[PDB]
From Swiss-Prot, chain A:
Its main location: cytoplasm. Belongs to the AAR2 family. The gene is AAR2. Residues 244-265 are annotated as: Leucine-zipper. It comes from Saccharomyces cerevisiae (strain ATCC 204508 / S288c) (Baker's yeast). This is A1 cistron-splicing factor AAR2. Keywords: Cytoplasm, mRNA processing, mRNA splicing, Nucleus, Phosphoprotein. PANTHER family: A1 CISTRON SPLICING FACTOR AAR2-RELATED, PROTEIN AAR2 HOMOLOG.
UniProtKB/Swiss-Prot annotation, chain B:
It comes from the Eukaryota. The MPN (JAB/Mov34) domain has structural similarity with deubiquitinating enzymes, but lacks the residues that would bind the catalytic metal ion. Contains a region with structural similarity to reverse transcriptase, presenting the classical thumb, fingers and palm architecture, but lacks enzyme activity, since the essential metal-binding residues are not conserved. It is found in: Nucleus. Changing residue 105 to K: Severely impaired growth. Reduced growth at 30 degrees Celsius. Strongly reduced growth at 16 degrees Celsius. Residues 7-237 are annotated as: RNase H homology domain. Functions as a scaffold that mediates the ordered assembly of spliceosomal proteins and snRNAs. Required for association of BRR2 with the spliceosomal U5 snRNP, and the subsequent assembly of the U4/U6-U5 tri-snRNP complex. Functions as a scaffold that positions spliceosomal U2, U5 and U6 snRNAs at splice sites on pre-mRNA substrates, so that splicing can occur. Interacts with both the 5' and the 3' splice site, as well as the branch region. Has a role in branch site-3' splice site selection. Associates with the branch site-3' splice 3'-exon region. Also has a role in cell cycle. This is Pre-mRNA-splicing factor 8. Component of the U4/U6-U5 tri-snRNP complex composed of the U4, U6 and U5 snRNAs and at least PRP3, PRP4, PRP6, PRP8, PRP18, PRP31, PRP38, SNU13, SNU23, SNU66, SNU114, SPP381, SMB1, SMD1, SMD2, SMD3, SMX2, SMX3, LSM2, LSM3, LSM4, LSM5, LSM6, LSM7, LSM8, BRR2 and DIB1. It comes from Saccharomyces cerevisiae (strain ATCC 204508 / S288c). The chain holds residues 1836 to 2069 of 2413 of the full protein. Present with 468 molecules/cell in log phase SD medium. Changing residue 21 to N: Reduced growth at 30 degrees Celsius. Strongly reduced growth at 16 degrees Celsius.
Length: 300, 237
């Protein structure tokens, strides 16, 4: 079980660790989070009690080093940092655990929620969407723009999501205009899966990462990526049987986890109605369609 | 974005533009089968592609053979339209290519946009205008060339005849829409008005009768009267 210690909690803040969240008071004796399951990515995220604007956070994998949080009173945020001195860190953490100044990652044993939302998400692929190659962890926030947003402004502080554009020379073969526009199988299978992603796992990986950035940070560009990657599959007549069965499970858990009160801004009416009712795959997402109908019948 | 009465004179500036109407591309007669079911029989169609400044009409004839063995023909018709317009633009020298193409129906936007991905500098636009281009096939000489075609064919017309020798393109376009609006509301009445005085003829190289300027005012007057009445009848007002 891994630990992310904190130096202190000098400003009052809501701390998220994956799907969980805890309120910490200004100068409350808080020294971080223990019992974090090894083997999965994690995100630790923040919303200041004084600014419910700029939700921000850190994607990290505990196997890739010893990480802690320290408040920076110049830049005014909780910063992720790496402690390279193994013994100092072990010693720091043991003092704080002995003093019980740490909250426990509160995994329920039956609960596979986090595995199901992160199944294909790989820290090494996150570090290529979020480029800050001097850190093992990746910062994301509410206002970060995507590379595709910047095309239609700082290239260093962007989400390098795979560009998907249904009205692009990339997506449409000359002399196959009508065919490729109404059936995106060639854009999905040859251009995206064979050409760019190499396999379905990397495609599902970016899709799951876009959704989680949307949900945890209200990142608008991420929400657009997540919908785009869903629409590319729903609008393809030819999709491997295992991709569809796995997509149905992916979306089921995403829809299950979405805060009830956020469906209005995080769900795109046109994409979901298309996928579930209009598209080639209307009969292929049984779990997703059942949860969407019982939980968000309004949207449809 | 979309073209309306608030940016109307844009049609007659010196930026090359074309209207594309696809309303006569896919044409059918509906008939009863021997077993008493209903079937369609396709007839020849046309793409109405008009330079509203010059009056140059690029009439692409759509021969019924293009539909042979195809499914979802109303949908294919929009993609066949986009394919032909695109082929037409690529056939023109660069200095003759349109800077904008305005489609009369919004369903043509995505087909044409996709077929013109090679031309990012050509703006594809809808219109809020209700243009009567559907009535193109009430023009005898255009209907004649479409119905006689035995193969796909492109025929070039000037839909203004020689009018621009005497009037501006704003006025020539206004006369054209008045003529086509009349033909669309009551083909028979409109056609009687245009040929009632058999001393006025249509030249071999023209579409419309050779009216003096005063005769055109009278004709124009009669088309407005026709349009107004039919509207009273339609709405009982």
């Amino acid at each position: 079980m891994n630990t992310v210690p904190f130096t202190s909690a000098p400003i009052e803040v809501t701390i998220g660790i994956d799907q969980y969240s805890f309120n910490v008071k200004e100068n409350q004796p808080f020294h971080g989070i223990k019992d974090i399951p090894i083997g999965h990515v994690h995100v630790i995220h923040f919303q200041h009690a004084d600014n419910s604007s700029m939700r921000y956070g850190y994607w990290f994998d505990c196997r890739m080093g010893n990480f802690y949080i320290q408040y920076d009173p110049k830049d005014g945020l909780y910063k992720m940092m790496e402690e390279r001195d193994g013994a100092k860190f072990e010693n720091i953490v043991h003092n704080f655990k002995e003093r019980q100044m740490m909250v426990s990652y509160p995994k329920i044993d039956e609960d596979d929620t986090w595995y199901n939302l992160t199944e294909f998400v790989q820290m090494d692929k996150i570090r290529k969407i979020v480029r800050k190659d001097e850190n093992q962890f990746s910062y994301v926030d509410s206002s970060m723009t995507t590379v595709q947003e910047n095309e239609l402004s700082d290239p260093a502080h962007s989400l390098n999501y795979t560009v998907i554009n249904f009205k692009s020379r990339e997506a449409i073969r000359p002399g196959h205009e009508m065919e490729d526009f109404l059936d995106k199988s060639y854009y999905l299978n040859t251009v995206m899966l064979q050409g760019i992603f190499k396999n379905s796992s990397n495609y599902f990986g970016e899709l799951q990462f876009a959704f989680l950035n949307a949900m945890f940070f209200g990142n608008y560009g991420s929400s657009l990526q997540w919908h785009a990657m869903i629409e590319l599959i729903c609008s393809s007549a030819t999709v491997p049987k295992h991709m569809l069965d796995k997509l149905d499970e992916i979306l089921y858990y995403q829809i299950k986890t979405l805060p009830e009160q956020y469906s209005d801004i995080l769900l795109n009416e046109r994409v979901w109605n298309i996928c579930l009712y209009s598209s080639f795959q209307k009969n292929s997402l049984h779990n997703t369609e059942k949860i969407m109908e019982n939980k968000y019948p309004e949207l449809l | 974005g979309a073209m309306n009465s608030s940016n109307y004179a844009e049609l007659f500036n010196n930026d090359i533009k074309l209207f594309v109407d696809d309303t006569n591309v896919y044409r059918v007669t509906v008939h009863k089968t021997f077993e008493g079911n209903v079937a369609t029989k396709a007839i020849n169609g046309c793409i109405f592609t008009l330079n509203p400044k010059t009056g140059h009409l690029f009439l692409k004839i759509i021969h019924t053979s293009v539909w042979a063995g195809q499914k979802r023909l109303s949908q294919l018709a929009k993609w066949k339209t986009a394919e032909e317009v695109s082929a037409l633009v690529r056939s023109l020298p660069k200095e003759e290519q349109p800077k904008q193409i305005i489609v009369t129906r919004k369903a043509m936007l995505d087909p044409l946009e996709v077929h013109m991905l090679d031309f990012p500098n050509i703006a594809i636009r809808p219109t809020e205008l209700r243009l009567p281009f559907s009535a193109a096939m009430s023009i005898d000489k255009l209907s004649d060339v479409v119905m006689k075609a035995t193969e796909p064919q492109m025929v070039l017309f000037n839909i203004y005849d020689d009018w621009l020798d005497r009037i501006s393109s704003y006025t020539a376009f206004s006369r054209l829409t008045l003529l086509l609006r009349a033909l669309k509301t009551n083909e028979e009445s409109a056609k009687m008005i245009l040929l009632s005085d058999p001393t006025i003829t249509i030249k071999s190289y023209h579409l419309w009768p050779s009216f003096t300027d005063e005769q055109w005012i009278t004709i124009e007057s009669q088309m407005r009267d026709l349009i107004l009445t039919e509207y009273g009848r339609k709405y009982n007002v």
